[PDB]
């Protein structure tokens, strides 16, 4: 058995005792930190400090029982280990609560704010610690049984799979769904929208009207240009077609490539550019076009809608994957995919929307697309959550591998040499309770401010203490 002196367990338990106390006091005393995320972080600091306190308290009790020299050891063992088990389940729940808090505050920011009042968050955190303590007591009673060890190992692989999903989305696929703020900016334009729109419509020789725009690839079962081309055919026979201007861009297959220019010729008010324009001119098009139509059959990332919403274009897209999660009711119009008749109704509905001042609608699109920036506070909380789970996974990894060996290869000589280093895995677990306060401070500017007001009072609650 790997030996480390009992001084370490008591010391590490005290460091986290002071750190996580400072975390809870700071979040409570600061009115700006009364958000649901910091309330789940507050409970995470509670479960973190109870673990390191219980491990330090257990070491003192262990060092006392072997010296004074029974059957009372088993009872205090069943209670100390019950606090560790209940806090571990709460530590997993507090991390998943932040994950749920980050998923909803990113996509459905306002609907989550109304339902997650200051009262309802206290009920959930209370219910989490209720089911965790009840499950913690039953886990320790049947700690040698199979269902308990299979359950805890499963919970670690769940946190491991969620961490792998977060590293793939945030870091690997960073440039896949990340909006570019330095490029998709209205500052690169000049004038008003109708001023730029008349210049664009005169550049193609057209009367001023409601300008719809499609950009993408001409394919038969992917981007959905066939849905839009038949939507123009349906709208062709109507009377409201004369107030519309369509600009379709994208090269694909000659069957649809020729159909686009077939409608461009038989209608005049339709412009078809079978070339791949530079990103600088597509930026200029979004700042002038009234509505951007994205009739995609499959769009995993809403980046195509975010790029147009930054420059004030109002998207008319399908409720498919990424376009579904980005576009709400106030910042666009959604329709069923593959339906050309329903898309024509959205184009007719968008024509009626143009009769009022869309300056607020475009200001909602700019605001909605502005929150998905990598340097924004919304996506920054997801990276803070990825650090919190990646830290918890690494610190608890050797323990759960020892838990796997306990049930899969206890007699194996190689698994025995690993399980004998268990006292190292306890120290690593206690380091999760010390590193976590360092993560909240490093990734929260408001928490460092209230940290300085306490480190200055810790120097001020000492002059009045000695005089």
């Amino acid at each position: 058995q790997l030996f480390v002196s009992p001084v370490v367990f008591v010391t590490l338990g005290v460091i986290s005792l002071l750190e996580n106390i400072l975390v809870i006091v700071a979040i409570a005393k600061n009115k700006n930190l009364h958000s649901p995320m910091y309330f789940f972080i507050c409970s995470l600091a509670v479960a973190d400090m109870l673990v390191s306190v219980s491990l330090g308290f257990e070491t003192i009790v262990i060092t006392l029982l072997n010296s004074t020299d029974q059957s009372f050891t088993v009872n205090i063992d069943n209670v100390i280990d019950s606090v560790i088990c209940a806090s571990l389940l709460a530590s997993i729940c507090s991390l998943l609560s932040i994950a749920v808090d980050r998923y909803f505050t990113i996509f459905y920011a306002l609907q989550y704010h109304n339902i997650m009042t200051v009262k309802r968050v206290g009920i959930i955190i209370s219910c989490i610690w209720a089911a965790c303590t009840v499950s913690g007591i039953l886990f320790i009673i049947y700690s040698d049984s199979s269902a308990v060890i299979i359950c805890l190992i499963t919970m670690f692989f769940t946190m491991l799979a969620l961490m792998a999903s977060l590293y793939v989305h945030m870091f690997l696929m960073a440039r896949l769904h990340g909006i570019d703020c330095s490029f998709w900016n209205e500052s690169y334009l000049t004038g008003s929208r109708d001023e730029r729109k008349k210049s664009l419509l005169s550049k193609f020789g057209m009367d001023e009207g409601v300008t719809f725009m499609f950009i993408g690839r001409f394919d038969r079962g992917q981007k959905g240009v066939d849905v839009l081309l038949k939507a123009i055919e349906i709208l062709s026979s109507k009377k409201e077609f004369q107030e519309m201007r369509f600009i379709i861009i994208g090269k694909g297959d000659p069957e649809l490539e020729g159909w686009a220019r077939s409608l461009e010729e038989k209608h005049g008010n339709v412009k078809v550019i079978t070339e791949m324009l530079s990103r600088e001119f597509v930026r200029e098009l979004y700042g002038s076009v009234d509505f951007v139509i994205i009739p995609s059959y499959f769009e995993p990332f809403g980046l195509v809608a975010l790029e147009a919403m930054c420059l004030g274009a109002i998207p008319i897209a399908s409720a498919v994957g990424g376009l579904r999660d980005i576009i709400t009711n106030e910042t666009g119009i959604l329709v069923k995919a593959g339906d050309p008749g329903e898309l024509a109704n959205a184009i007719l509905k968008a024509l009626e929307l143009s009769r009022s001042d869309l300056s607020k609608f475009r200001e909602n699109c700019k605001k909605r697309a502005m929150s998905f920036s990598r340097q924004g506070a919304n996506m920054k909380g997801a990276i803070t959550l990825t650090i919190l789970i990646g830290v918890f996974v690494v610190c608890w990894a050797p323990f759960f591998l020892h838990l796997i060996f306990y049930i899969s290869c206890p007699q194996n000589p190689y698994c025995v040499c690993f399980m004998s280093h268990f006292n190292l895995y306890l120290i690593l677990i206690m380091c999760n309770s010390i590193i976590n306060p360092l993560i909240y401070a490093l990734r929260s500017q408001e928490l460092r401010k209230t940290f300085k007001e306490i480190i200055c009072c810790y120097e001020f609650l000492e002059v009045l203490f000695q005089g």
Partner: peptide, 8 residues
């Protein structure tokens, strides 16, 4: 009475 559980 071991440090933590799953020790004996």
């Amino acid at each position: 009475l071991d440090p933590x559980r799953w020790r004996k």
